[PDB]
Amino acid sequence: VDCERTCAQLPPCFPIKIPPNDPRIKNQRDCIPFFRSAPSCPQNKNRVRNQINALTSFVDASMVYGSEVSLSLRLRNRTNYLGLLAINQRFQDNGRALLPFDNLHDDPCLLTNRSARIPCFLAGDTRSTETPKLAAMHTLFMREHNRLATELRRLNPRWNGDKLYNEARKIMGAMVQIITYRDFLPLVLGKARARRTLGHYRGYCSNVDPRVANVFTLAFRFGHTMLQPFMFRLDSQYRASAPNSHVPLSSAFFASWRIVYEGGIDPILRGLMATPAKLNRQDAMLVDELRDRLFRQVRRIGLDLAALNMQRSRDHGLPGYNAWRRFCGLSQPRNLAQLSRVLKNQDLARKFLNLYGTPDNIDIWIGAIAEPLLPGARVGPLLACLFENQFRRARDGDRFWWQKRGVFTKRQRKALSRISLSRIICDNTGITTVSRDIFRANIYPRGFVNCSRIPRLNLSAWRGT
Amino acid sequence: RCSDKYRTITGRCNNKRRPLLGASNQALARWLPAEYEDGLSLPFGWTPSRRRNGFLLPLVRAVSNQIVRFPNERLTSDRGRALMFMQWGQFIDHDLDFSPESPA
Ligand code: HEB
Ligand SMILES: *[C@@H]1O[C@H](CO)[C@@H](O[C@@H]2O[C@H](CO)[C@@H](O)[C@H](O)[C@H]2NC(C)=O)[C@H](O)[C@H]1NC(C)=O
Ligand SMILES: *[C@@H]1O[C@H](CO)[C@@H](O)[C@H](O)[C@H]1NC(C)=O
Ligand SMILES: [Ca+2]
Ligand SMILES: [Cl-]
Ligand SMILES: [Cl-]
């Protein structure tokens, strides 16, 4: 049945019920819709249910290229042999490329501004327009692929279209791995902690299982606590001068029309560099733009992302908080006194026990994001353990890890080591002043430099290879 | 024969002895055994009266209302991280995993 149009507990639904004291939803028979995740290999019925991962577990830029062959070809520009990704044929952003449009039945982007009639963008992953901030990243990386294939053609005029696409794709996968492991993970975990728990790369291990685990798909939603209530857009002087510079997120979900008609991706990229993230605090976890107004412009009711995350771990048959603490070699608090020490917060521990009775039953996302943050990190110990486990596997179990001997040449690894997300912005946008340490909060003009000061990717090591 | 120069699109052939490891369209790995109300597929919370470890489960929306919800005066910006840090996290999450929903 259509879980958006009934609150009955009929297949494949698992509706989120409304409490009597709800501060927002006052219809006691309403629900927040919820479709269960599809089961893997549905033929066997007496087996324990598992959920599917539709994407490649490797950090390989599959969100740009696709994880299915037919989709990966659909994203390519098939009108020439330049090895490019297809671009929007109707709109451009100050002369620069935009993503092609998708062709969805009941396209949600069309519902965000009925008169603009701008559908969702098409990229390697189905969620590319969940915000215009995420669509801006997808657009930026599609441009970087085309810039790489264009420069590789200049160096290698006899390479065919497939070789140009394959080589640009291989460089892009390495850049995504470098930005992730060198820049992002040390700031999630703490720099010393990332060095100690991930360690230096020692080579490929064919006995490592690189698959993404079911629990990681819930734990890595810790990011939801870092959203501010607005999408921030800034002009070329990094000022919120336009009259709609602070867009509430609940009017920006799926709003591809904002990229097409409200200034392209540069104001969005500038907003991301120059605005601080929200800090996860135990008494300020998730903004109401996500906890109460999620997707309100495209669904019959504003959803609650925290409720979806907790219902989703139940849907996915995940063990509770203490089972995951035990998996990580952490203590299993059994009562109020112990939970108060683990959370460094008696009032929060009391609220958890009033709701759950035992910490054994706390749903993984809420218990994990409630842990106090480790010094230098944006995670407590449980999320640090789970993320270290997943990212260690994704690196050590990947036969195409960028540092593995034979994947790239020594000269190519040296050239790749100079890349940065700031350089990708400089190379593919009209922005000429960027933050150098892009993931740190930089209050403009502090930490911002001209693009000429940011190292470049020298592609000479790809000539004649 | 798996290639030694380029990745496949689907991730197949990254592990030569177990070619589907890490490939798309497969079951998510489990780091611990699954826990369902009936031991097979019904989620905990499916039957309101079915206890987990001897206790009734709260409504996920009640947990959200009582613990997650907060007023504007407590919103705190992170002095050490830009929104670009958050955005890289969503973007890399979309390189790693997506569980499709069951259709209507
Ligand atoms: C709208 C929205 C945003 C940005 C405004 C967002 C952000 C993040 C960030 C920053 C993440 C990690 C650093 C992150 C990870 C994951 N998300 Fe979240 N996210 C948004 C919305 C959603 C919605 C809706 C879902 C699905 C909820 C449900 O269970 O019904 C969601 C999920 C995820 C996932 C799981 C992906 C999967 O494997 O299916 C991750 C890892 N986000 N998001
Ligand atoms: C395939 O690539 C070509 C070459 O880059 C694209 O051609 C550009 O098309 C736009 C209009 O869509 C023109 O304004 C440009 O002047 C063209 N550039 C050149 C050098 O010819 C073409 O759009 C791409 N096709 C697809 C489907 O992505
Ligand atoms: C919808 O988009 C059009 C541009 O096509 C714009 O003029 C209009 O203001 C938008 N509507 C809203 C509510 O922002
Ligand atoms: Ca991937
Ligand atoms: Cl809010
Ligand atoms: Cl798991």
Author numbering:
A (entry chain B): 251 to 715
B (entry chain A): 140 to 243
Original paper wording:
Eosinophil peroxidase (EPO) is the most abundant granule protein exocytosed by eosinophils, specialized human phagocytes. Released EPO catalyzes the formation of reactive oxidants from bromide, thiocyanate, and nitrite that kill tissue-invading parasites. Mature EPO, purified from leukocytes, is a highly cationic 77 kDa monomeric glycoprotein. Together with myeloperoxidase (MPO), lactoperoxidase (LPO), thyroid peroxidase and peroxidasin EPO belongs to the peroxidase–cyclooxygenase superfamily.
Here, we present the first crystal structure of mature leukocyte EPO at 1.6 Å resolution together with analyses of its posttranslational modifications and biochemical properties. EPO crystallized in space group P212121 with one monomer per asymmetric unit. Each EPO molecule contains an N-terminal light (L, R140–R244/V245) and C-terminal heavy (H, G250/V251–T715) chain resulting from the inaccurate removal of a four, five, or six residue long peptide (V/AFTA/G) from proEPO during proteolytic processing as suggested by mass spectrometry (MS). In the X-ray crystallographic model of EPO, the last clearly resolved residue at the C-terminal end of the light chain is Arg244 and the first residue of the N-terminal residue of the H-chain is Val251. In accordance with sequence predictions, the crystal structure of EPO shows electron density for six disulfide intrachain bridges. In the crystal structure of EPO one N-acetylglucosamine (GlcNAc) moiety was clearly resolved at Asn363. At Asn327 we observed electron density for two GlcNAc molecules as well as residual density showing the presence of additional glycan moieties, which could not be modeled. The electron density map clearly shows that both ester bonds are fully established, that is, between Asp232 and a hydroxymethyl group on pyrrole ring C as well as between Glu380 and a hydroxymethyl group on pyrrole ring A. By contrast, the electron density for the ester linkage to glutamate in MPO and LPO is weak and suggests a split conformation altering the pyrrole ring A environment. In the crystal structure of EPO, a water molecule (W1) acts as a weak distal ligand of the heme iron. In the X-ray crystal structure of EPO, a citrate buffer molecule is coordinated between the crystal waters of the active site and Arg549.
